[PDB]
Design a protein around this ligand. Structure first.
Ligand SMILES: CC(=O)N[C@@H]1[C@@H](O)[C@H](O)[C@@H](CO)O[C@@H]1O
Ligand SMILES: CC(=O)N[C@@H]1[C@@H](O)[C@H](O)[C@@H](CO)O[C@@H]1O
Ligand SMILES: CC(=O)N[C@@H]1[C@@H](O)[C@H](O)[C@@H](CO)O[C@@H]1O
Ligand SMILES: CC(=O)N[C@@H]1[C@@H](O)[C@H](O)[C@@H](CO)O[C@@H]1O
Ligand SMILES: CC(=O)N[C@@H]1[C@@H](O)[C@H](O)[C@@H](CO)O[C@@H]1O
Lengths: 47, 47, 47, 47, 47
């Protein structure tokens, strides 16, 4: 629970480290947007 | 109180994590501008 | 003490959170620049 | 273990500090991508 | 003692806070680049 890092790439993609995993995707648009469920998993550990 | 993350997207929108929630909005232009009151809630928790 | 956050906006302005307040201004060019005295107070608390 | 800093350059390259060393490279695109194995070492300590 | 902050400006300059001092410079190109030996000191304390 909670992100360790949460930051943008210069194209506007949101990146986040959550439970040692790395995710990316376009940023959420509302509190109805389950961002983590639709984010792409781009790293399985070590972050 | 207190933000856990406070950062910019490349289009100039300010993003912030406050009390596990995610907020965005144009940055304040003066200390009369209550940013958190006018920011768009874009995540209800898990941040 | 020091800063809680210190980060750039995409237009090149340096932002900083210091003693719960939000500051912005052009980045310092030498150690003779008192950036905190020089920056614009854009938020009086809650940061 | 884990990263101490993880952030983007405006040229699109991902930078990270891991165990006091500095690395850069294209961001990972999947959890098969061993980013730290293929990243360019650009700093052997002090970070 | 490492860096407290390490981040880019949108023109590609790397900024870092180290022992409460603020440094800037082009990012290191390889592990043979002593960045902090050649970085510009732009803040002597308070960071
Ligand atoms: C910090 C880092 O590069 N972690 C990666 C991880 O994301 C990836 O899923 C795994 C693939 O084997 O390799 C590494 O552990
Ligand atoms: C980290 C993350 O994606 N959190 C979101 C939250 O912001 C959103 O309000 C909720 C919708 O049900 O889904 C997830 O919990
Ligand atoms: C986090 C946040 O938006 N803080 C603001 C503060 O910056 C501003 O000076 C004040 C104006 O009334 O309102 C809020 O407290
Ligand atoms: C913080 C910093 O500038 N560290 C560098 C290190 O990355 C580099 O590999 C070394 C070369 O001798 O010099 C310095 O220690
Ligand atoms: C956070 C900040 O602005 N620190 C500066 C420091 O960089 C500068 O060298 C000194 C010179 O007067 O003034 C301030 O203390």
């Amino acid at each position: 629970s909670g992100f360790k890092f949460l930051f943008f790439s210069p194209d506007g993609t949101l990146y986040g480290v959550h439970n040692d995993k790395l995710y990316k995707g376009t940023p959420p648009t509302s509190d109805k947007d389950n961002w983590l469920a639709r984010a792409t998993l781009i790293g399985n550990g070590g972050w």
